[PDB]
Amino acid sequence: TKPIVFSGAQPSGELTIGNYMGALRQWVNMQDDYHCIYCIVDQHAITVRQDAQKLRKATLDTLALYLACGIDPEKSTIFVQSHVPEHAQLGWALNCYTYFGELSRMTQFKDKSARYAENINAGLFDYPVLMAADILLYQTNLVPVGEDQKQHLELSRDIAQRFNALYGEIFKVPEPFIPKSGARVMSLLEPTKKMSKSDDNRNNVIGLLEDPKSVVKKIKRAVTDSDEPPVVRYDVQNKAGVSNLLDILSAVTGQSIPELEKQFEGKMYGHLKGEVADAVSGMLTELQERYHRFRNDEAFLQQVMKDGAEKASAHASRTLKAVYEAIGFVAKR
Amino acid sequence: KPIVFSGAQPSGELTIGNYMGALRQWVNMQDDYHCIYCIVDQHAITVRQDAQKLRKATLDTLALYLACGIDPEKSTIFVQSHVPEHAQLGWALNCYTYFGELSRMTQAENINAGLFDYPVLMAADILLYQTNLVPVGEDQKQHLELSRDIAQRFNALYGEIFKVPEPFIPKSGARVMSLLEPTKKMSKSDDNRNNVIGLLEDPKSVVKKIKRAVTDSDEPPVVRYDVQNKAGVSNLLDILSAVTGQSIPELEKQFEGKMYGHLKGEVADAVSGMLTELQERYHRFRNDEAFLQQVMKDGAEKASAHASRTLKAVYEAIGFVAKRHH
Numbered sequence: 304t305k306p307i308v309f310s311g312a313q314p315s316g317e318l319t320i321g322n323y324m325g326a327l328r329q330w331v332n333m334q335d336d337y338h339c340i341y342c343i344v345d346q347h348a349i350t351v352r353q354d355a356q357k358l359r360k361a362t363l364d365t366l367a368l369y370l371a372c373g374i375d376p377e378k379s380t381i382f383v384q385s386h387v388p389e390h391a392q393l394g395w396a397l398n399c400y401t402y403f404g405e406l407s408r409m410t411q412f413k414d415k416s417a418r419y420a421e422n423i424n425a426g427l428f429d430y431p432v433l434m435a436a437d438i439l440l441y442q443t444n445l446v447p448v449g450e451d452q453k454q455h456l457e458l459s460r461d462i463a464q465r466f467n468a469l470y471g472e473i474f475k476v477p478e479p480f481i482p483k484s485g486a487r488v489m490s491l492l493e494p495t496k497k498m499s500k501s502d503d504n505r506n507n508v509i510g511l512l513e514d515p516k517s518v519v520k521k522i523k524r525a526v527t528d529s530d531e532p533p534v535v536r537y538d539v540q541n542k543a544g545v546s547n548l549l550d551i552l553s554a555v556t557g558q559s560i561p562e563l564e565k566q567f568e569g570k571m572y573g574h575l576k577g578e579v580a581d582a583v584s585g586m587l588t589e590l591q592e593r594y595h596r597f598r599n600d601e602a603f604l605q606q607v608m609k610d611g612a613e614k615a616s617a618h619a620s621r622t623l624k625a626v627y628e629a630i631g632f633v634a635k636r
Numbered sequence: 637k638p639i640v641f642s643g644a645q646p647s648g649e650l651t652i653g654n655y656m657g658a659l660r661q662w663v664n665m666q667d668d669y670h671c672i673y674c675i676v677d678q679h680a681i682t683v684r685q686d687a688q689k690l691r692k693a694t695l696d697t698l699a700l701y702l703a704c705g706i707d708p709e710k711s712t713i714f715v716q717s718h719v720p721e722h723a724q725l726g727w728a729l730n731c732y733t734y735f736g737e738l739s740r741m742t743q744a745e746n747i748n749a750g751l752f753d754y755p756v757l758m759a760a761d762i763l764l765y766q767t768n769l770v771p772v773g774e775d776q777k778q779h780l781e782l783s784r785d786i787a788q789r790f791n792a793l794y795g796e797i798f799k800v801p802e803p804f805i806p807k808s809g810a811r812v813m814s815l816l817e818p819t820k821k822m823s824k825s826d827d828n829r830n831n832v833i834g835l836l837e838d839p840k841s842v843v844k845k846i847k848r849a850v851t852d853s854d855e856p857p858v859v860r861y862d863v864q865n866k867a868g869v870s871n872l873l874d875i876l877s878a879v880t881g882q883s884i885p886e887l888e889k890q891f892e893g894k895m896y897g898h899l900k901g902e903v904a905d906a907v908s909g910m911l912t913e914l915q916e917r918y919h920r921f922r923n924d925e926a927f928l929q930q931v932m933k934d935g936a937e938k939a940s941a942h943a944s945r946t947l948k949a950v951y952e953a954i955g956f957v958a959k960r961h962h
């Protein structure tokens with residue numbers, strides 16, 4: 304049997320070119336090489352308060368976007384987290400092998416808490432434990448994520464090792480799969496802050512379903528630097544904006560940073576932004592054309608969710624049975 | 637009938653205080669209320685413990701509740717982990733529970749997240765079954781208040797999804813104090829086990845513990861009820877009264893001119909007489925694997941039918957895409 308890939312994305316906010324280059328691009332590329340399982344994590348999404356109509360619509364938007372990206376339900380398992388009870392069941396059990404201190408020091412908990420001061424809820428605190436359960440249920444070997452989820456992924460490894468040390472080889476210890484390009488795509492007007500799928504300022508983001516014409520204008524207004532003469536060179540510390548533009552271009556076109564720096568010799572930020580805008584506009588035009596074909600086909604989305612939850616349940620029920628046997632529960636008849 | 641929810645820990649060995657107080661009270665109210673008894677194995681694992689002992693203790697607890705007279709045809713009795721909806725609702729309710737509410741619980745770096753987060757699972761345990769009444773000890777009144785706050789908060793956003801549970805106010809009326817500390821209530825959790833009589837203790841064990849039970853230095857010895865001045869003798873009278881149904885004044889009359897050895901002898905005989913039918917039922921039920929399997933299966937099926945209806949309404953209110961059944 305092939306090694307197992309697992310990853311997820313939240314049906315909340317609006318997925319960006321950051322979410323694509325950090326995660327979804329790798330998801331699509333891994334589908335023949337590994338046994339891939341991809342999840343729409345609606346139980347994680349509600350750690351930030353959602354409107355009920357927007358959450359239901361966003362779950363189906365996210366599913367159609369996975370399909371539009373090239374996630375193939377004949378090759379990959381695609382399912383909605385809340386459809387598989389084992390996630391919450393294993394999440395509770397793993398709370399008992401996770402320390403309070405490990406959770407309080409999490410960067411996501413701190414950042415989301417500062418943003419949503421009026422809804423610092425237990426779900427937002429307990430986020431990493433349910434995420435560990437999501438991964439460990441599927442005997443997962445690789446977890447393709449962006450740089451921002453590295454800390455959560457490291458806790459899931461700590462939990463797996465801690466549980467295995469007491470009970471035996473119940474879980475696989477998962478490894479991160481973080482890409483070389485586009486692991487941390489930055490905000491267009493604040494290039495020291497990562498691109499957010501829920502930014503109050505839309506001018507910071509390249510949304511995967513945004514009007515390409517709107518995206519081209521935002522790229523042209525992306526902040527660069529005061530360098531005289533202007534030079535197209537990758538340097539995060541001194542040239543955050545220009546570096547972010549080169550990272551995006553590299554990720555879309557497949558061209559290396561040395562290749563792009565050579566291409567832009569004797570050229571300035573007009574040429575760079577022109578090439579970023581053209582590459583991104585083309586990618587989003589084609590992606591969006593595939594998206595609407597899937598998104599408006601409710602019979603197809605309904606079948607993908609049904610088949611996916613069925614495949615996921617078979618794997619998850621096997622792992623949870625072993626966890627429950629190990630910790631000493633009377634087995635359900 | 638109103639729905640009543642009780643969580644039964646699979647660890648504590650029950651005492652005559654547990655039985656003659658709350659359990660006997662509730663055994664005789666199974667036709668008055670829809671009583672639910674949930675053996676809370678998912679709560680137990682917040683304290684690291686031997687796995688085989690936890691499996692054993694789950695079955696020990698099921699058999700003893702059945703032996704005490706919980707009727708699986710009248711009441712719903714099941715193992716918590718057999719009903720996924722508990723964990724499912726508990727995660728959902730985490731997202732409507734303030735971090736501050738769990739921080740402010742009366743009860744930090746090396747506490748496990750289970751010991752921090754279990755009040756939310758307790759809220760889910762109650763709210764799943766549209767529970768009207770919860771019998772709580774003083775120790776879990778804060779937990780019931782959080783469950784009520786979560787229910788009202790969720791209902792305020794989404795409509796009347798949950799019943800707001802109430803504490804079951806009226807108490808048993810049977811008083812059972814610690815044998816070597818009669819000011820302290822006889823507690824299953826008591827570290828000193830010479831203070832307690834467990835429901836599975838043999839007649840020789842009961843004689844030994846009752847003979848050590850503290851009394852007083854009154855001369856002549858006098859069997860009279862007086863909690864302030866004669867806490868020990870008063871406790872022995874309350875235990876004998878709870879077993880036999882004889883009034884305190886009748887027992888004071890019965891032990892006129894009698895010494896504390898006579899009282900102790902009759903307390904031990906009365907208690908062991910009560911524990912005979914209980915222990916006979918226990919050892920019969922505990923060693924009938926097919927009977928315990930059938931009770932757990934039927935109980936989980938009844939619980940799941942109710943729990944699934946509540947969870948479906950919660951999931952619909954939150955806006956989750958409904959699962960596609962195969």
Ligand SMILES: Nc1ncnc2c1ncn2[C@@H]1O[C@H](COP(=O)(O)OC(=O)[C@@H](N)Cc2c[nH]c3ccccc23)[C@@H](O)[C@H]1O
Pocket residue numbers: 309310311312313314320321322323324325326344347433434437438446447448449450451452455485486487488489497498499
């Ligand atoms: N600016 C950015 N640049 C590059 N990558 C980025 C950027 N912003 C976000 N990402 C990545 O996008 C993925 C989805 O993010 P979500 O917030 O939906 O979703 C999250 O952040 C996960 N906790 C959801 C999850 C739940 N359970 C799991 C189990 C395995 C893997 C992932 C999960 C993520 O991989 C994230 O790293």
Ligand SMILES: CC(=O)c1ccc(C#N)s1
Pocket residue numbers: 390391392393394395398429432433434436722723724725726727730753756757760
């Ligand atoms: C019952 C409850 O509170 C939970 C279920 C899954 C969790 C995680 N992680 S917490």
